[PDB]
Amino acid sequence: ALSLTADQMVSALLDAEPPILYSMGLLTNLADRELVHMINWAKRVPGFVDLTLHDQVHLLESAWLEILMIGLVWRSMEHPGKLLFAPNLLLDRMVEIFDMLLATSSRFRMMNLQGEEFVCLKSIILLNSDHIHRVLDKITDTLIHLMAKAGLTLQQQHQRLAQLLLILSHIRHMSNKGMEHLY
Amino acid sequence: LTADQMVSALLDAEPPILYSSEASMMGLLTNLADRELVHMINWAKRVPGFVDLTLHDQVHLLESAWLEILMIGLVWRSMEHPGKLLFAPNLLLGMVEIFDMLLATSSRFRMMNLQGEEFVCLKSIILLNSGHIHRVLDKITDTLIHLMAKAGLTLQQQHQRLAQLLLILSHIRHMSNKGMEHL
Ligand SMILES: C[C@@]1(c2ccc(/C=C/C(=O)O)cc2)c2ccc(O)cc2CCN1c1ccc(F)cc1
Numbered sequence A: 001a002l003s004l005t006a007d008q009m010v011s012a013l014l015d016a017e018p019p020i021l022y023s024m025g026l027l028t029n030l031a032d033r034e035l036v037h038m039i040n041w042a043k044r045v046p047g048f049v050d051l052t053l054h055d056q057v058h059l060l061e062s063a064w065l066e067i068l069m070i071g072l073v074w075r076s077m078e079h080p081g082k083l084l085f086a087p088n089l090l091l092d093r094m095v096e097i098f099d100m101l102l103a104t105s106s107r108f109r110m111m112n113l114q115g116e117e118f119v120c121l122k123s124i125i126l127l128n129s130d131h132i133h134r135v136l137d138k139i140t141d142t143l144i145h146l147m148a149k150a151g152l153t154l155q156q157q158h159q160r161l162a163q164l165l166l167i168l169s170h171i172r173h174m175s176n177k178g179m180e181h182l183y
Numbered sequence B: 001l002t003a004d005q006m007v008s009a010l011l012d013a014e015p016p017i018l019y020s021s022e023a024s025m026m027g028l029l030t031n032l033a034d035r036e037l038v039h040m041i042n043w044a045k046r047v048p049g050f051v052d053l054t055l056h057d058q059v060h061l062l063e064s065a066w067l068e069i070l071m072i073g074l075v076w077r078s079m080e081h082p083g084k085l086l087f088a089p090n091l092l093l094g095m096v097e098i099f100d101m102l103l104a105t106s107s108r109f110r111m112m113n114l115q116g117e118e119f120v121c122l123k124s125i126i127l128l129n130s131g132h133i134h135r136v137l138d139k140i141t142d143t144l145i146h147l148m149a150k151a152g153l154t155l156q157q158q159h160q161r162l163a164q165l166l167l168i169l170s171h172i173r174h175m176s177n178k179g180m181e182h183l
């Protein structure tokens, strides 16, 4: 967990990955079926099981929607102007949240976000929304290595890591707007 | 502008510290916040790269960031005052939820031993992030790293500190959202 290397952290994350399911009622039914596979992914995040049930519940209640959003943004990346809710539910341009989702998707695309970098971002969201901080520092370590072992200079590595984490503020912002609509 | 010239430009741009029943409390807080907004606008004009932006882009960034800016400044003032919020030197104190979240942020920056130099960098990041811009944000990332390097942190600690700071901004954005909601 705190002893895992960069490669091992990515391997545990890429293999923890939930499947892509198929389909407001249609989106609610999709989101409910996605919840169950998210719980399974979360129990496979290194360090997450080393927390008590109530801390795990607290982290999932806060992160749930941002986790749905980031996966949606990722799977929609190679479909500009469209949100791929499911392979059978690709929606063209609550529309307030949708344009933000599209902008996050454009941003991730022009940055050329990698699958290994994505799964790292998903994990941080779950943990950020002493042990928790040590694991986050390990995910920070995991992130820099992928950029280092991609041909980026130490300056470009800190710049990409900044840009990536600043997108999480925008992801937090969309989840708040989403939670406002639901309640 | 160099990494050293950036910190100096920012530190000089710092706004002054202003002075200060639910309606009574809200009256005093709204009054202070409205006076602080005038100095925040003038501070924004001194942030390297901000005046290069169109007046339309300046308005949008400030409209988006204002409450995050009031909040980070509050958090930074309340740092060496545990369990209290330094709204003003004469004002050290259904809004307790946002208040307890602000106190947690204060404790976090205290734990982390946040430095004034880093604060002004975090404050500038918010203004540009919340709402060319990317190259300026990239310049503030270098600046934060250049300061972490000068304090004698290893390259590992340097990138771990960068991440630790930028993830607090997600929580700052979350606090502004709940606050904008209450207002
Ligand atoms: C459409 C939806 C969503 C998520 C949860 C629920 C549950 C409702 C309930 O419990 O009644 C419904 C829809 C979604 C669904 C599945 C998915 O993979 C990704 C996203 C992206 C974010 N999103 C969303 C939520 C609220 C908004 F205001 C705007 C967008």
Ligand SMILES: C[C@@]1(c2ccc(/C=C/C(=O)O)cc2)c2ccc(O)cc2CCN1c1ccc(F)cc1
Pocket: B029, B030, B032, B033, B036, B067, B070, B071, B073, B074, B087, B095, B098, B099, B178, B179, B180, B182, B183
């Ligand atoms: C108290 C207040 C605040 C900021 C803006 C206004 C504007 C009112 C209006 O426009 O009517 C009122 C209070 C504050 C005051 C001064 C300051 O330096 C920093 C902060 C940051 C946190 N904050 C806050 C806002 C909303 C909440 F729900 C909880 C807390």
